[model samples]
Target: QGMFITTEGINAGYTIKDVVEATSSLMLASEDIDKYNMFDQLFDEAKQKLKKKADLLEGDGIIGLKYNTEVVEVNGAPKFLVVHGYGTVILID
Candidate 1:
């Protein structure tokens, strides 16, 4: 099976094997300030981890994928971006 992750929702014949979740956090290090799409980078990081967990469960795909992010701060300045991802791991029937 291919690695399939989406937030648009899934409609297919599958069994919910389990619920999966993963979290990733990133900080703007000196070498990363110039990086483009930092938000996407953080999201991809979290999504990938979630996908890996689904893979471990031998999931055909993940359904109902959802995400949330928050800006963590230090000294009133943004220090890190924390992302959370969740989905229902499924097995295609």
Candidate 2:
């Protein structure tokens, strides 16, 4: 299973599946790396969740993948971040 994710789909031979979604959050008092990298790590978790959901549906991958995020600020500094990724799962030839 190559299992991939993408924002678009081909013209044929694939099932347009029901949408699947996942979320992740970080309140890192600072994980191993610095600022932006810590934020980026949330994507790693979210992708893990995304894969979990799609696999449950017997999907081979995702198409039309979309994402959104919200960073919470305390005293005008980044304190927390939550993210979501969603897509139409697919079973393709």
Task: Output the worst ten-in-a-row residue range by lDDT, candidate 1.
Answer: 28-37
TM-score of 1: 0.83
Estimate, for each residue in 14-90, the C-alpha lDDT of model 1 and write its tens digit.
Answer: 78779999888888765555553688977888788888899999887788889888877677666687889998888
Off by over 4 Å in 2: 30-34
Global lDDT of model 1: 0.79
lDDT of 2 by residue, 9-91 (tens): 76768876689888898774644224766667888788878878888899888888878988777675677888898888888
Instruction: Look at candidate 2 and tell me the lDDT of residue 59.
Output: 84
For each candidate, what is the lDDT? 0.79, 0.78
